[PDB]
């Protein structure tokens, strides 16, 4: 899986 902040992603 990814982590991600809705719009501000920024992992995997």
Same mark, same amino acid.
């Given at each position: 899986? %990814?982590? /991600?902040?809705?719009?501000? /992603?920024?992992? %995997?």
């Amino acid at each position: 899986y %990814c982590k /991600f902040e809705x719009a501000t /992603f920024x992992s %995997c």
